[PDB]
Design a protein around this motif. Sequence first.
Motif: not given
Ligand SMILES: [Ca+2]
Lengths: 184, 40, 48, 48, 98, 48, 62
Positions: E40, E42, E37, E49
């Motif tokens: 982005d 990752d 959160c 997210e």
């Molecule tokens: Ca992220």
Amino acid sequence: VTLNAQTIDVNQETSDLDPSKSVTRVDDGVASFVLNLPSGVTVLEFNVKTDAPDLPEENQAREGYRAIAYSSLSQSYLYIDWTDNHKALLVGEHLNIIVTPKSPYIDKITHYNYLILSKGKIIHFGTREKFSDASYQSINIPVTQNMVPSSRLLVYYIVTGEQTAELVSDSVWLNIEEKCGNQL
Amino acid sequence: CGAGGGLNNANVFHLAGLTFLTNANADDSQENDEPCKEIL
Amino acid sequence: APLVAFQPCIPSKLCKIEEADCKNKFRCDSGRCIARKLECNGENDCGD
Amino acid sequence: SCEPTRGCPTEEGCGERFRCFSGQCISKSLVCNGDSDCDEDSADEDRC
Amino acid sequence: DKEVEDCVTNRPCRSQVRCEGFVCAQTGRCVNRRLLCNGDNDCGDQSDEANCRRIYKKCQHEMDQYWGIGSLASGINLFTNSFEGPVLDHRYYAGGCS
Amino acid sequence: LLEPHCFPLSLVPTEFCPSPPALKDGFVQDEGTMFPVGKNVVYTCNEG
Amino acid sequence: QEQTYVISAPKIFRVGASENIVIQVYGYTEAFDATISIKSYPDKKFSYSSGHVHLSSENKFQ
Ligand SMILES: [Ca+2]
């Protein structure tokens, strides 16, 4: 006595418990309560007022308080399962406190550890281990004579993330029976 | 001073009358107490 | 061959340096006491 | 391979100072300063 | 350049090196919990997210990738002197935004 | 002397006092196979 | 940081008071020992007391 309790979530959400009422005891002075709380709770702000009907309520004495989560940056926690029982443990009885290492990283936590202060000094120390059942040994040991005025139990573990590591801890006051080793 | 718990890992030890030395990212040198009045 | 050397070493006295109270001048977070006139100045006189 | 009488040195964090993901240490007055004070990983800018 | 077959052996295996943070469900990456959160991707497939009770942004402005920085992300065959394919995640920002 | 743990250590001692003298009507409150240089003992006199 | 320790001690050591000083270590699979000590300050060259504690799998590094 009556109580108001505005919990606050992990997020913006503010949520109130239903207002609660009890009387202060006659031999103990205590009015005691237990609050359920959201699984996400970050804080509670709570207020207490005297509910005595003789009070004109604007002169009725009241107090407000605030209570906080243990603030792990790694969001790893350690909870002593003790209900803050008022009656003292009797000399030489087994202690019966359960402990939970609530953590994102529990596969790394083989054990947790504990210390007992009495008066100013540590008088016991030890280690408690993970079951195949994924709970951990309780704090069993007998309330030895070195504890008797009163004692304090503290508990900890250290856990790694991938690359951080954090001290994770809890502590509880243990009331012990006023009885001597000389037994005089 | 007080019945237990703490704001953070260091403050658990400090409120419990302990102090500690660790490499695991804490130091109660951060902390002080008032003249205590938390009656148990 | 470098012109000076320093060895890590155990103290043998307390440090005696003072903190600045600075008579109502405004102590910035890096420790400069700027003139009291500049409290809520606008711009940024502390740097901080 | 060799069995050492030498310890591996432990590695040590930040105490009163904030700590980034690398293990470098930075002042608590630089958490949520909104610059990237942690050189690479800006943990001082996480979830403010 | 290869031939491969399945097996029926029962030797013990220790393949469970712990993802301490969060398993990226599709890619099998792990990401540290401060990156969930962060606004982005990752995990590669946006998994980190999901179900964000809030998102926190970091980058105050639009910010280009340095040019070719994703091209440098790939390993070389040193003998043909060629980039072959992708080895380090040059779309990963670990907080970052400096 | 500053930073011992960076080096090898024989953390087990190799220099010692001989066993402490006894006393009339008392004993060494501590006991062991050897006492290293600068290790204390304390005495306690016996009952009465 | 796989390897870590805590020493704990009372907030204040009492003078002549046989203080009980606890160590734990973690991230270890091999035994070793440690001279927990009370030393002169600031000058760190004299020892008021020391204990060569052994840290082992037997005591789970405690
Ligand atoms: Ca992220």
